[PDB]
Amino acid sequence: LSKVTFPGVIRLYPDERYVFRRSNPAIVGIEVIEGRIKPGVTLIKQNGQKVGVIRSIKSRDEFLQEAKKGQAVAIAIEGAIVGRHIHPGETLYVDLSRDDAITLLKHLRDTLEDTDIKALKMIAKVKAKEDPFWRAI
Amino acid sequence: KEFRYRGYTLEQLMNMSLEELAKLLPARQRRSLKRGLTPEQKKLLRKIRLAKKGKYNKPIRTHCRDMIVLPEMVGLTIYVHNGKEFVPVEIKPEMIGHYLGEFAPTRKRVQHGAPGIGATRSSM
Amino acid sequence: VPLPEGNQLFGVVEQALGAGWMDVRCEDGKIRRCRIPGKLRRRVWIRVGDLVIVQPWPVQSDKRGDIVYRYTQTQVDWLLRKGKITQEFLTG
RNA sequence: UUAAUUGGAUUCAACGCCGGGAACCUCACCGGGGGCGACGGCAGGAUGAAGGCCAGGCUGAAGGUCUUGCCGGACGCGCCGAG
RNA sequence: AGCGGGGUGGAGCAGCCUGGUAGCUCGUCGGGCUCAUAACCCGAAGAUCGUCGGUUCAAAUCCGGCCCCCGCUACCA
Ligand code: MET
Ligand SMILES: [Mg+2]
Numbered sequence A: 001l002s003k004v005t006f007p008g009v010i011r012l013y014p015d016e017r018y019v020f021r022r023s024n025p026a027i028v029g030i031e032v033i034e035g036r037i038k039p040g041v042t043l044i045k046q047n048g049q050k051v052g053v054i055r056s057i058k059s060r061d062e063f064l065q066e067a068k069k070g071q072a073v074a075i076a077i078e079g080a081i082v083g084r085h086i087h088p089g090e091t092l093y094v095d096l097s098r099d100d101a102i103t104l105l106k107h108l109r110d111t112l113e114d115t116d117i118k119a120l121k122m123i124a125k126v127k128a129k130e131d132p133f134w135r136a137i
Numbered sequence B: 001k002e003f004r005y006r007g008y009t010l011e012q013l014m015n016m017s018l019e020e021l022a023k024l025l026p027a028r029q030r031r032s033l034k035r036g037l038t039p040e041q042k043k044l045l046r047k048i049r050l051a052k053k054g055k056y057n058k059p060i061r062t063h064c065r066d067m068i069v070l071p072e073m074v075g076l077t078i079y080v081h082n083g084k085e086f087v088p089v090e091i092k093p094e095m096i097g098h099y100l101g102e103f104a105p106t107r108k109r110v111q112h113g114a115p116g117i118g119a120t121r122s123s124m
Numbered sequence C: 001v002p003l004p005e006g007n008q009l010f011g012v013v014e015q016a017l018g019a020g021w022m023d024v025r026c027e028d029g030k031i032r033r034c035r036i037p038g039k040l041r042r043r044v045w046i047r048v049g050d051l052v053i054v055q056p057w058p059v060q061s062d063k064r065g066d067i068v069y070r071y072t073q074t075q076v077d078w079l080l081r082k083g084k085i086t087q088e089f090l091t092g
Numbered sequence D: 001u002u003a004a005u006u007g008g009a010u011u012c013a014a015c016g017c018c019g020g021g022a023a024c025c026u027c028a029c030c031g032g033g034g035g036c037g038a039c040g041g042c043a044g045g046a047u048g049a050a051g052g053c054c055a056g057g058c059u060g061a062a063g064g065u066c067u068u069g070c071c072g073g074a075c076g077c078g079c080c081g082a083g
Numbered sequence E: 001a002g003c004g005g006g007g008u009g010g011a012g013c014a015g016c017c018u019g020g021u022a023g024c025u026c027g028u029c030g031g032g033c034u035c036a037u038a039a040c041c042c043g044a045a046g047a048u049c050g051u052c053g054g055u056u057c058a059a060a061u062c063c064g065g066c067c068c069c070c071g072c073u074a075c076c077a
């Protein structure tokens, strides 16, 4: 279980307020659409640009560990810049490993629920662009 | 806007001796008719006349590609061998004086592909 | 023309590694370091980007395999028209 | 490319070369239709083997085969070897 | 977010400032040389200049509005 990475899809607020720092690090609020956010997980767009790795997450001044469904949290990420790299109101996807997807669909099929399966399915549909493996899911 | 062949309607062509008709055709047809018809053409012509009379309610199939179209053959449909199968030909008035084989192509049209290895000097 | 029978499956050659070793991408989304039997090695020339039949080794059947047959242009065209295999597997 | 576009020859020492100027034949290729087994033996066979035909269908056209019954007298691929 | 810089064949650069032919090297296709390949020689294709407008006898060159790319700084949930 510790080896695989949970799927996750989020969308940036179209609100200017949530942006608290632009670069080094990029600090911006987020609401979770599906899946679970964890520290040290790479995020990619539809075209797959490496926006970096989530450096830290905080719902308040306190330090957090993870965020579940229906929770808002400010992410401080590295390698992402508003504008050229990321735009407000744009939807972000968690990069997935095909071995991890196979493990989730076959080995760890007991610990999978509605939001997780929806997120993983739509992530596979989105990633079905280059490798036919995601096309066949 | 009727049909005429040398100033004659179709019916005037119908009531003509084979010799009188031969004076209207081009030289190749005239020489072919003057030298007589081959036995195979005789059998085909017999079948055609039978079909016109009201008998022989069967399709006409023939290997004779060198038969000349004649006015009394107008209106019938003939199946001419092209090498591997018989194709239907519907005889129209403006076909008088042509060989049957002209209406049954023996080669397929060519659609080229990509040149293969050895098509140019550099590919060898 | 012959089809895989058993654990065999198709594959696309990706890169030759030398000394009769190829790197074949199979239909199950795996990359395998495949070994060419010498019987057909001497008479059949294989080049990157071909449809072939690969049987995985009995032990560690995830990264090793043997190539048994090569599909010519007419055979792969017939397979594509029939629909047993798609175009994106061949094109990648 | 095609039903087939028959094959050989690839530096000098293959490419108006195979005496290769192919309408048929040539011809080896493609579509279709017919014919053929010395010599041994098995079935069978003068109570007639094998073989041939006026007419008419089938057919591109054909006693090739079928329909319709006439002609001929001693060998026999329906079976096995062999040629 | 503010400031500064730049968009030209498939690729990387001239041609500005001084308006009036769109060049340079590599790359692709074809023919040469060699028993054959690479190297070398010849010929040809390929951008009408990031878009839109203004100016001018005439604009890739001067000017302005947009689209994209790059750099610097402010920016602590
Ligand atoms: C931090 O200032 C915080 N209020 C930003 C949004 S948390 C989802
Ligand atoms: Mg030839």
Ligand SMILES: [Mg+2]
Pocket: none
């Ligand atoms: Mg000639």
Ligand SMILES: [Mg+2]
Pocket: none
């Ligand atoms: Mg001939």
Ligand SMILES: [Mg+2]
Pocket: none
């Ligand atoms: Mg060379």
